[PDB]
């Protein structure tokens, strides 16, 4: 049993200093090579830094240039990461693993098998203020056909929020887009959920949103402007 | 760096016959030995990037049979052999004859489905949301297969870029669904200087890019 | 330095010393940038120390925050290893067998 616990999460700062630290059970540590591999935000997965199985630096990336460190402790099976000069964008899914090659195996040092990816923490690296949610209902048109209406939530800090429909008692059609960010690190989402267009009088329109760390919990509605 | 493509971006593949899929290098990986050091990657949605295969020929034991490596030189091809529906996802190649190792484009496959002309709307923002100082017009591209039907947002006949955004669900399970918001922002001012506002949508069963445009007011 | 601050080996050894050039290989392109090492620190380790306390250096009282270069001195110093290694300049491996 394989496992990789990976620390260091929780809301920081871009530009401060940050340790992150991945503890290895379920095998022998200190004989295979070891992996960092980037993933920002809404975006790909891409490769950050790396180790030997001598516990010696593969390096850094383009953007990161002599600025992060990575260290092994090999008394406690455990894998250090410290990060420094964040900004908005170094942001990313850090994710920690070891290599497949064996020592005295099939030359070189082989460095390469990305094989067992433990749960990489969510490092939040970004600054921005406390913005208030804006929930609005995006009024239904006169739509035979299928009617289309939604409630976005914009402008709001921090990120996780939820939303439901009519208290699940509207389930089909629900596709919450994800939210787009913007320059000043604001959010914007959009539930739109298609529905039958027959039934524009008997249907109450009402969207529950959640901001937890606001305690948000508001019961809105959607009515067109007409 | 090594200059790494993936090709083809995104290929819809049928169950039954294989695929070849190809990552292209700027340097022979060829070593010493003569071991190239291509390995291919795997990742589903919801799901961490997962190995598929080791030096395209060079086996370990315990790695899937279904992924086949070949190629000579610079370029190496991944061939689907074995055929199922899972084999949709996103994949990766990467270079480890020298350092740093990088990531390709990447590229998602999907089983094909019939293609249909999509249904497109469109939703001009609500007044007392225009109140907040911006415009988020909204377009709705529902039912457009494959992903390939491309959104053109025209205030005016503008020909511009940025500023539009375009958030697309996932493959839905019924006929492959794929329902499309368009946001377009503009600035207060700029709602009230102008009149139309215009999503156009480009798709292959479309021999008419429709333009759906509405106006200020009604 | 290179005792108290790079690292710190027992005054008794019990073994032998070996080093070599490792100037073909310990060396990138055109200069090994990834590689440092520790000279900057307030505190002396225990002989035969893996010290993994890669935070700021921080001489003095400046809150740094996290924040690198202004006040706040970076831990590590880098290894130029480029073609320019001579006799001193070159990356000797060291290895100490106690």
């Known amino acids: 049993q394989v496992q990789l616990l990976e620390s260091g999460g929780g809301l920081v700062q871009p530009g401060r200093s940050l340790r992150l630290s991945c503890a290895a059970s379920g095998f022998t540590f200190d004989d295979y090579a070891m992996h960092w591999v980037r993933q920002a935000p809404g975006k790909g997965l891409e490769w950050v830094s790396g180790?030997?199985?001598?516990?010696?630096?593969?390096g850094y990336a383009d953007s990161v240039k002599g600025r992060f460190t990575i260290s092994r402790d090999n008394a406690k099976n455990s894998l250090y990461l410290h990060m420094r000069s964040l900004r908005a964008e170094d942001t990313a899914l850090y994710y920690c693993?070891?290599?497949?090659?064996?020592?005295?195996?099939?030359?070189?040092?082989?460095?390469?098998?990305?094989?067992?990816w433990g749960q990489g923490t969510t490092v939040t690296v970004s600054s921005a203020s406390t913005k208030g949610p804006s929930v609005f209902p995006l009024a239904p048109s006169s739509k035979g056909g299928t009617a289309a209406l939604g409630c976005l939530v914009k402008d709001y800090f921090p990120e996780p929020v939820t939303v439901s429909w009519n208290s699940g008692a509207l389930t089909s059609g629900v596709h919450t887009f994800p939210a787009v960010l913007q320059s000043s690190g604001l959010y914007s989402l959009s539930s739109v959920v298609t529905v039958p267009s027959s039934s524009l009088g008997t249907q109450t329109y009402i969207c529950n949103v959640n901001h937890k760390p606001s305690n948000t919990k508001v019961d809105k509605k959607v009515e067109p402007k007409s | 760096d090594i200059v790494m493509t993936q090709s083809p971006l995104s290929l819809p593949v049928t169950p039954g016959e294989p695929a070849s899929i190809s990552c292209r290098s700027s340097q022979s990986l060829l070593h010493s030995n003569g071991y190239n050091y291509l390995d291919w990657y795997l990742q589903k949605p919801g799901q961490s990037p997962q190995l598929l295969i080791y030096?395209?020929?060079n086996r370990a034991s315990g790695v899937p049979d279904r992924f086949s490596g070949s190629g000579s030189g610079t370029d190496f091809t991944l061939k689907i052999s074995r055929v199922e529906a899972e084999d949709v996802g996103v994949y990766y190649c990467?270079?480890?004859?020298?350092?740093?190792?990088?990531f390709g484009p990447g590229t998602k496959v999907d089983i094909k489905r019939t293609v249909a002309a999509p249904s497109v709307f469109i939703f001009p923002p609500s007044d007392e949301q225009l109140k907040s100082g911006t415009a988020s017009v909204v377009c709705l591209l529902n039912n457009f297969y494959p992903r390939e039907a491309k959104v053109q947002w025209k205030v005016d006949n503008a020909l511009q870029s940025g500023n539009s955004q375009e958030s697309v669900t996932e493959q839905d399970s019924k006929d492959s669904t794929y329902s499309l918001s368009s946001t377009l922002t503009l600035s207060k001012a700029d709602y009230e200087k102008h009149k139309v506002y215009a999503c156009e949508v480009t798709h292959q069963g479309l021999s008419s890019p429709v333009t759906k445009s509405f106006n200020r007011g009604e | 330095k290179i005792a108290d601050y790079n690292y710190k080996l027992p005054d008794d050894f019990t073994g032998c010393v070996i080093a070599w050039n490792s100037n073909n290989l310990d060396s990138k392109v055109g200069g090994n940038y990834n590689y440092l090492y520790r000279l900057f620190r307030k505190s002396n380790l225990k002989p035969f120390e893996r010290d993994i306390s890669t935070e700021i250096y921080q001489a003095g009282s400046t809150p740094c925050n996290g924040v690198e270069g202004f006040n706040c001195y970076f831990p590590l110093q880098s290894y130029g290893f480029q073609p320019t290694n001579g006799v001193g300049y070159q990356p000797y491996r060291v290895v100490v067998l106690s």
């Open positions: 693993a070891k290599a497949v090659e064996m020592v005295r195996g099939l030359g070189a040092d082989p460095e390469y098998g990305m094989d067992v």
């Open positions: 990467m270079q480890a004859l020298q350092t740093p190792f990088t």
């Open positions: 030096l395209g020929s």
């Open positions: 180790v030997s199985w001598n516990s010696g630096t593969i």
